[PDB]
Amino acid sequence: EETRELQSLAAAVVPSAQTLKITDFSFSDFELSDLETALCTIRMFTDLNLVQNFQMKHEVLCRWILSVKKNYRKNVAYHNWRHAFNTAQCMFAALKAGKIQNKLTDLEILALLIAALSHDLDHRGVNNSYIQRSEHPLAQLYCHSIMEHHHFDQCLMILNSPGNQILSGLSIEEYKTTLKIIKQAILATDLALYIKRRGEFFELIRKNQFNLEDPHQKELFLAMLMTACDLSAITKPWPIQQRLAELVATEFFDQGDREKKNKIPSMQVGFIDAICLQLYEALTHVSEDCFPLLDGCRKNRQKWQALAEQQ
Ligand SMILES: CC(C)Cn1c(=O)n(C)c(=O)c2nc[nH]c21
Ligand SMILES: [Mg+2]
Ligand SMILES: [Zn+2]
Description:
Structural class: mainly alpha
Number of strands: 0
Radius of gyration: 19 Å
Bound molecules: 3-isobutyl-1-methylxanthine, magnesium ion, zinc ion
CATH superfamily: 3'5'-cyclic nucleotide phosphodiesterase, catalytic domain
Number of helices: 16
Largest sheet: none
Oligomer: monomer
CATH topology: Catalytic domain of cyclic nucleotide phosphodiesterase 4b2b
Order of helices and strands: HHHHHHHHHHHHHHHH
CATH class: Mainly Alpha
């Protein structure tokens, strides 16, 4: 029953951020039920003052969260609701604990939270070609970042569904700006785009020319931040990361129409060196308080490498 789930969520009391541990970069969701993750998501919107600043009605926000959750496929090992929820939690932590909140506007924070939660909507698994083959054949080269555009379309449809319009409170101009930031935020989760633009971000930091005051770099930062949250499972405490790596490995090797372990340690070390280390280092420079993400990433590299050499 769906309306029953909505009834329960809407009537439930929302515990504090401290009680939910959502401010911790080390946050984990394994012990939480779907209902509990939904309550954590409400707390994120609430504490970031989005519910107040944009006059969201409780029942609407609840319905929206449940529609979002419902549109991820639980049969997919990694790209599912829990990943999206975790990505948003990391965004929340980076904003609060990481003190990034003060460097952005309310509309940017609103867009980021929604994007984090919506960035992988309807994902069918890295080894699934359905979404791509269901579009205009040579559709891969025309509308590039095909998956991300799909995720955004899904995000937008939910945002416009009756009873789910959490942005109805914004003015038309506020709305167009938010939608634009949300779209860019989601497109940014395409690693191909991350690898294409990260160089500029890194370059701007070396020369100490990074300036969030100019729109170009702010947009570049939001894109880098989204990626940082999207890959944050790589920064978790060793016992947690070991588990999240299992999920990634399952989707990569076992799923796609559904020894393995040995491939995992080297895969995670390669992933960290090639994609993660520089990003979290860069982020730490922008905000000293985001260090734990980097620290966590390093500790995990050490652990996986030790296994790679065989413990
Ligand atoms: C999921 C995949 C597309 C990218 N990706 C990721 O996000 N995390 C967290 C990993 O640990 C990982 N290992 C390989 N690829 C990975
Ligand atoms: Mg994605
Ligand atoms: Zn993702």
